[PDB]
Amino acid sequence: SRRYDSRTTIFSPEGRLYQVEYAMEAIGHAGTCLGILANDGVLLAAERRNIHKLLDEVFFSEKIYKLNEDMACSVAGITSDANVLTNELRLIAQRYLLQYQEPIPCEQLVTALCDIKQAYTQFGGKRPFGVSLLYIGWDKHYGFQLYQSDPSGNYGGWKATCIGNNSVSMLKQDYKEGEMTLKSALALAIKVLNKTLSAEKVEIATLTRENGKTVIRVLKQKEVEQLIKKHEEE
Amino acid sequence: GYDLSASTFSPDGRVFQVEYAMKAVENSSTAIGIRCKDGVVFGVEKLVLSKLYEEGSNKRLFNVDRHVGMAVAGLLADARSLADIAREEASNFRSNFGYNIPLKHLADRVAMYVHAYTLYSAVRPFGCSFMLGSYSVNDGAQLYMIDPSGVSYGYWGCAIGKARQAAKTEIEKLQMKEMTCRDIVKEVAKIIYIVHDEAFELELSWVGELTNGRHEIVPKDIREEAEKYAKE
């Protein structure tokens, strides 16, 4: 009945979308995982849920998801929805291969996912996908690149943007846009996460290469105990 | 506001869109049906508004399958709708199973049709009580009566309408079991003239051994014989 519908696909009298900016406040409750690119490859830097021992082993974490040989994605907000959509977008990646025998240049993928997620906020009367997930990737066309999207639908090349709480302004006083030298990108990542820390309560993951094929590393345990002692002051 | 939708209960378990349909047949005229050993006799009260309507302006004794009948009470649109789909239901039985439809199965079928039609907010309940009635050569004079709730009971002398509070008493005091239907056609007028307390241009139909499993408006002679039960 028309008394019962939440009426998600309605413009406000101020013109905005009520169910969309409620998803934007869902990101600020739970969300971390910045991403830094360099002249070399790109990394995510992430946070787990809490200190609660009672957690045996994650193959990959609940944060960094593999998508192709040359792409990966990280997730903010509601974790139940995005899992679905990331499997959804994973399907998209593979069928581009089936249509083209190319490793899907990542802007095609981000455009496709943002079109279907825009389609859930356009009609159907359903709630929008409450996740502002972001993407890292490489293609032969462009360089190493990361994109960042939100439950509204728009996206962009967001060279050092983080998602979730405590919002990135320090990064737009510290990132050198020309050259970055990915070891120092790790150093800047543990700087920002050191302000906002071993791999019990951090989840950092890099994307690099050797001889053409890309390598997605999840930065196993003892590397984090290296970088956490790479400070004195910061 | 626990009202206005058939998919929402009361806080004491009483779906108000059904009992609002039940009073919606209590503001409409009576139609009594009396069982006896040779068949079932119907009789419907008519509340002729103007002189402009002719005789049988609205049929309220429909028939369905060349032997069961349709004394209806409430909204004639809804009653006429379930009358014609009862016609289609006995059509699917006779076409499907060959054997002529026993009335218990038709009353259970139309009963669960109008009941399963009260489980959704996307439909309203029907607003029409109605009753059936016939006999096969080995059935007995089966009649059933169906509420807008969808419950169907076998009766002897059921009466639906506005003045069913009056009408159930005389049918109870009338000798029920062993008389041979012609007298009770005559006696039906006594019930109809008692319960009409205000043109009462009534109408009767039955099924009996004078009919051999059929329906007729009376034939037409008791309309000038049961009219002679004025002054009672």
């Binding site: - | 499907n96 199973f97 060959g98 054997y99 026993p102 218990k104 080995n138």
Partner: protein, 202 residues
């Protein structure tokens, strides 16, 4: 494949042969073409084998659900009617010349024939199957009127003995089933119980 069913009085007496040939090889020497569908109503089956018992348990479903829906024992005319419908609507895909019988409490002995094209007629005696063309003379000549249970038992027995003797696609034991008021009394005829007839020798 030869089926007989004779309405004697009150109830009926069925009868069926037992072979399932794959052209020229008896794949099943011992099968029951008699089968129950409710309690008293039995259907037989002829022609093909795969389709007709899909029809048989399909109408066990529909007839059983209808019979429990009425809380009354159903008529044989009901089952033969949905044999007319179920076999008529699929008439270009089914070779099922089934002839059915049973005792309804209302009428009595009823034997209906649903042949290969798919229809319904009521008969005193019915007959249907592959070999059921070699005994129209004997069944047409011997069946008199109003016979009893023992002489329709031996009548169906030696009629099916003729038809299993002369057809090549019909043979083995024959199964009789006498539907009556007190339930089915079926039996088989095992070898020597078949009424063997003498062959003339030239």
């Amino acid at each position: 494949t030869t089926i007989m069913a004779v309405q004697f009085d009150g109830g009926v007496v069925l009868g069926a042969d037992s072979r399932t040939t794959t052209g020229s090889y008896i794949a099943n020497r011992v099968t029951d073409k008699l089968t129950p569908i409710h309690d008293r109503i039995f259907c037989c089956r002829s022609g093909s084998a795969a389709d007709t018992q899909a029809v048989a348990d399909a109408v066990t479903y529909q007839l059983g659900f209808h019979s429990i829906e009425l809380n009354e024992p159903p008529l044989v005319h009901t089952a033969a009617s949905l044999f007319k419908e179920m076999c008529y609507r699929y008439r270009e895909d089914l070779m099922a010349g089934i002839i059915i019988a049973g005792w309804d409490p209302q009428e009595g002995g009823q034997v209906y024939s649903v042949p290969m094209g798919g229809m319904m007629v009521r008969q005193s005696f019915a007959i249907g199957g592959s070999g059921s063309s070699y005994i129209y003379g004997y069944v047409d000549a011997t069946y008199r009127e109003g016979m009893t249970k023992e002489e329709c038992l031996q009548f169906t027995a030696n009629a099916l003995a003729l038809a299993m003797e002369r057809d090549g696609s019909s043979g083995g034991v024959i199964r009789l089933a006498a539907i009556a008021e007190s339930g089915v009394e079926r039996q088989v005829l095992l070898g020597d119980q078949i009424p063997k007839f003498a062959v003339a020798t030239p």
